[model samples]
Target chain A: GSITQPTAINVIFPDPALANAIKIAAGKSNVTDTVTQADLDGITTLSAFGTGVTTIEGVQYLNNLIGLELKDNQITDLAPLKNLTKITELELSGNPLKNVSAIAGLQSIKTLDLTSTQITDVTPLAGLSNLQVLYLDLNQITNISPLAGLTNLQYLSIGNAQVSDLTPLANLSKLTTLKADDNKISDISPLASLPNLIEVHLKNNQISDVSPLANTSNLFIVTLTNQTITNQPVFYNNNLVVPNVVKGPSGAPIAPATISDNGTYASPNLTWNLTSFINNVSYTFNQSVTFKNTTVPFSGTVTQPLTE
Target chain B: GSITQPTAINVIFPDPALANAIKIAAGKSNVTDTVTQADLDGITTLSAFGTGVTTIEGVQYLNNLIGLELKDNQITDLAPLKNLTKITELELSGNPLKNVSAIAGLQSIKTLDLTSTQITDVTPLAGLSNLQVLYLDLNQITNISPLAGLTNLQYLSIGNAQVSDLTPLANLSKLTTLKADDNKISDISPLASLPNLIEVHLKNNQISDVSPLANTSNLFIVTLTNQTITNQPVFYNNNLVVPNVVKGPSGAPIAPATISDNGTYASPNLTWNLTSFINNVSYTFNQSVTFKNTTVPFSGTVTQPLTE
Candidate 1:
């Protein structure tokens, strides 16, 4: 049978290699179709979409499948799918797995996408010792610091969760991309300690400032669109690439853009709209800086070592 | 020189084997002379009264005593008392022992009385893995289930606690005697499966029925004073052994006194007053009821006939 969008492909192809390729591409979408014992027995890397389609129901079966994606499905209980042991990426995001039994047995599972599920008590996820890239967006998840044990977690998206505390995420030294927008997080003191963060997107949340991301050694892409940040402290590192602040409501890039680090070291792209430079009362660096060009005197935490 | 109207002292020939002997018995209401650590240490067995001493603060220093009388004292924390591990029978009837942390380390304790205190949560008591007899009356405790793991717990008194749930005591199959009267518990469904239970005192609560306790095989004694139960349910073994019951608002037995196990097994000393017989109705023996017996029940599930 066929339907609108690739979510309705119910055909079990005779070609096992081709079937896997189709699933990996369209698996991220919803594909609920029943496959035979042979279809599931040979296939591996069953991506997120057809993850709801199992190896075969009503039988204790084993699989070498490394990735399984059933994101945004109606699967409630997990007792039926215990035998799938070889899976590394188990995406059950957007499901109602609240009282889920401990998943400690899934030792090989690394990337667990439980984003937007009905999971409130994540104490069970602490048992997933090898987890990385945990996507927990659009859920009622409150405190996620218990997941600090997952050492391989490089990508973490707590966007749209009910988390008001981010002090727990500070210790994750391996994290690269942090999407913590749409949260009530106020204290970024802990995030300042992490030196390896690259991109931090704080969009449409209760964050009032971005000055805390100062000493972040690897921060390149930052998107603070549609937020309550009134103060954009003078940037010391010129290479830090922040998204161009466009007009309000609609996404529009504004006027005379300037990308220069007059306060400190200058090597890379730091784009700022020209209107913001003149409207602000003063431009100041949050650290001791040595400038090469005469522009405006910046005063802040970085208010020392003025050079020409 | 604190004395009541008249007092009679019974003194026996002191045995040399008895290292500590009774020196004097001073308490509230009548006798007023305070007792000291040296006096308690000299007394090996505390069959005397020590209720009056405003402060028997260092009573634990009398480590030689086997029994203690610390009822109705100004003591708050029990941290100073754990060192008296040699005391088999301890009476802390009316002291503020809100924290049971000192209890986990008390290995030699067999009978512990916490009759009247501000104690609330009982999770700390779960750590007292070796406790056999515990008296926890006159406190603000809520649930009693955490005491289920007390495989060695036999005697428990939650009579005056604000606890409203008795289902937690259902797993304690080894409990022999339970005094949970004056609690907020409305259901005793978990107490029907206890085969070794001998006695229960559940008065002043909203216990509406006794049908749930139909299959309590070895139950010998039950006291239901001033409960809401209308009538006692017939036991499977028919041996309805209930102990003494306090007279109700109206002094009379609710149900006609009848002690017959019918075809059920043998359980003796079943006694109760009119108040409990009227308030408690019958309940179905749905779940296994444990009596907090410290000895572990023979592991494994069994669906056997009601056999004492």
Candidate 2:
């Protein structure tokens, strides 16, 4: 409780472990007395999770702080939050400190949680660009191409890093929910231009061509579990279908059946059954079976020999 | 697989236990073999969980069904899902359903999960109105005023029902996330016009004037835990703050000291602190303190007797 220096001067503590973690985060936000100096210039907000904070350099004299929570502190030299600049929701997750380039001029951050940090150069958070919701999961980031200009990201989780080239997420396009799991990706065709994707969880990386995810189309959910793909992809409703396989002629083995919308089959003899097929095909039977609205086929009368 | 019924008539089974639960929900969606009637007229999509199902009244010949999952069935007449009407995501949770007015005409539902049902009338779901995600948790519902015209709800959960009026959810206003926990709620000031609320839990209800939640303010999170309130509630960021108390004279208890921005206090002789009270509040001290930029108070000279 001592700060009557309206003018007196000579009161430096620059970084007494971030001024004792902002006086214990202003006494856990309830502000337990003794904050004077005009309550540290009318402090805005500060949260120091695990008290035992290491260093914050007197938090650049607060200067009208704006939401800061140093999780599980250990004093990592953030260069005194580089003059705060009205921070906007920043949580340095479970700190161990690596180097954040001192938040690269904050740029009015919008929800940034550096989870399980060990920071591996996010290129100074790509100048923030007003991030939407970012959680650098279990960091050690290998390189995210500066997150391709953020594009007002909606929600991004770079899981277990090592970063893989996603063509910088194809310009983000307001990504809905993206979790690049277990990185080292094998090309996701840049998530086929996001298109407000509903959910996407690229599990266990090394993808095997997801056919550009059938062009997003507001996907409801997507998780290529431990992918590699031998074929069988066919997405639809989210559309992608290219793989096919349905025979009877020189490839005989048709018994898949699962069609609707005016569905019918068992043509018996003049057999042409093979309507629509997608994902992982082998091909053989040929009498003209392109049905399923892909247009043409199963028309005229090209019945020769069919049996299923 | 017969459906040559270009027109025949009499094959009656109005509700042979819903035609054996739509032939066991089309053999658990895999459509195991015989389901004809043109595969229930090109059935749209159906899932019959825990298939020991009672009756679905032949689900009204599917009629181009959309999406339906009869969770853990023992089924109670849904009046054959009433005119199907291109259904849209409906799961009758743990069924024993009392009555659903047979879905009040479906209206292309947009996701409805009647959790643990015995539904005590939801006014037949208020004409559905393209509902956008609703789960009547463990039902026995006690009038929600038929959910106040839905209002294209964004996500609603009526937990362990017996619902206590929520002022019909105050014009919904595209609610973001609302979970009315354990019933008998005690007025929540209609959630103060929702404004895309981020989260609402309303734990163990029976609320007590939350000061109309100080007008939502895009709440990030809200949960009036086992409420009964007796003052001491003041949440500015998450809203809620209208109660004020600051006494001294005969009332004593004046520990309300958190006025910064050029702060100063100390003026003895029955002292109440004088030093520098710029933003208003001059000497004499006899009540009149609404600072925090609310203005008024201190004007000029009112000295008298001084001390420390």
Candidate 3:
């Protein structure tokens, strides 16, 4: 009589931490309870933030997943979540994910967090244009050439990576905040070409020159820091920072400009009081001043305020 | 008998045209009359646009000249506007002026229009950083290396010139409207790097490639013509016209696709009816197609959707 009961069956999850997290997410009371296929049936979104999930071995069975948040976990390989094509948001912050080619086909993804990982390549995210917010901070990522085509990005974090050139990022015009601190970044000229940038961070980079960020009336805040070469940058507004001015030629003591309160406001200016001139230019003020790193460096040396 | 009775001096203008223009600018009497010193005293801004003024020879006396608009005039020399350093705006369109060395020190000039002129050198404008709007179209300008540092430039017109290389213009990031139509421009990639570009006109140039403007979300309107190449550009937005397509490898008689409702909108996709393949990629559509200008072109041909 009990030969065949036409009912659903149950099985144990391979990862105990995942099992506990699933149990808690599905309103199950006990962690030791066996999980049925019905337990993962209605679950589309799951958050296991800081839940200590190391191995997601049995996660391959959650085929109905669309959003999975496992941030601050100890998980490494994502082979278990590879075939979940419907997933739109995948968060794996604080993990040691070396390869992310598993989620390459996840075109529906809008947000992804790969922060503080061991990922070295991000070519998989090249065609993921639906992505708006992405994090690749504290990783070994070197070449980000694939990111130029993902045009829908709004917020991006690539801090502490090996990215040097920002030429690829010239196409990301929709970006607002670009936190790319602590890397080997040098030429930031691409930032000026991408108009929508609002807030930016570029601490401890190889940027000995930042004239590219000059002449902007839209940027909100930009924070930059380098160890030495302490530049005498011009502060247009207190919010917009220009920490890339070069010391004047001749290294002569510049004539100090009286900070005359014309009832306007205070602005940091590198007044290079030149004793002469060059090219086809002539000036007065017995003591003329020059602004170095002015995007275009003027040719020749100063002989007097008159034409040289 | 009251010889020197507290009265202002009045004299006839040297140039009859400048005198007429002055009389017109000061709400004076008939055009064929004498212009007094009082008539030119308060003139800070003057527009003699389209006026048939031959020589601005006597215009040197206008000490209060701040803005002078003498566009579409027959005047050739700007020597009259030389010492007027307080001049903020100068419109000298449609003039055959050969030398612009006179305005080299007019640093207060915020707007300068020299369109359709015979001037060959623009090196004198290298120090005019305060200039916001400039027009250098229809000239013999072959080199614009001096325009890179004009950071505040919002609108610029350099059409119908002999400028071929645009590498020097890579730093003009604030430019909003760039009308460079009918020039010798081949590489228009610099347009994408200049972020604020809204309305661009680049008709009748040497542009055979247009992929640089691909991943933008900020541009408003970009007008271009001379699209002889039968391109198959993938449209991300309808506003971005992809007129720069190259002829395919096989030169097959590609059927122009019909615009049909795929439930809602019409998408222009070159459905290549091929039976083939390429490098590191595999696909089968019964019809395997290839996009020629896909940034990174695939290496091989379509033999099958199976792995090669």
RMSD of each: 28.4, 19.5, 23.8
- Stronger candidate by DockQ (1 vs 2): 2
For model 2 chain B, the run of ten residues with the poorest summed lDDT: B291-300
Per-residue CA lDDT of model 3 for A151-269, tens digit only, reads 98867889889998898888887776688988777667787787556457876665544456643323434665441222232323222322113222223332322211121112323
In candidate 3, which residue pairs get closer than 3 Å at backbone N, Cα or C atoms, i.e. clash? A276-A302, A276-A303, A276-A304, A277-A302, A277-A303, B276-B302, B277-B301, B277-B302, B277-B303
lDDT of 1 at A173: 80
- Each candidate's fnat, listed in order, reads 0.00, 0.00, 0.00
On lDDT, the leading prediction is 3
Interface RMSD of each: 30.0, 13.8, 15.9
lDDT of 3 by residue, B1-308 (tens): 11123222223344566666666666667655544555656666555556587788656666777767676778877776777767766778787788688888888887787877789899999889987678898899999988888887766789889887887767887675577877777666676577445446766665545445542222334544542221232423223222212222232322222211111111222222223332211111111222111111211111111233
For residues B28-144, could you state the per-residue lDDT of candidate 2 as single tens digits?
A: 332233455765767676555565667665567778877666667788777767777887777777888877787887888877778778878888789888786688888878888
CAPRI-style class, candidate 1: incorrect
Candidate 1, after superposition: displacement of residue A296 in Å?
18
lDDT of 1 by residue, A171-254 (tens): 778676688888766556677766556557766654434546643434434655444333344443323334332221112222
The 10-residue segment with the lowest total lDDT in model 2 chain A: A292-301
Candidate 1 ranges beyond 4 A from true positions: A1-41, A47-60, A228-308, B1-308
Candidate 2 similarity to native, TM-score: 0.30
Show where candidate 2 strays beyond 4 Å. A1-112, A115-134, A137-156, A159-198, A201-308, B1-56, B59-78, B81-132, B135-308
DockQ scores for all predicted structures: 0.00, 0.01, 0.01
Query: What are the TM-scores, per candidate, against the unseen true structure?
Result: 0.32, 0.30, 0.39
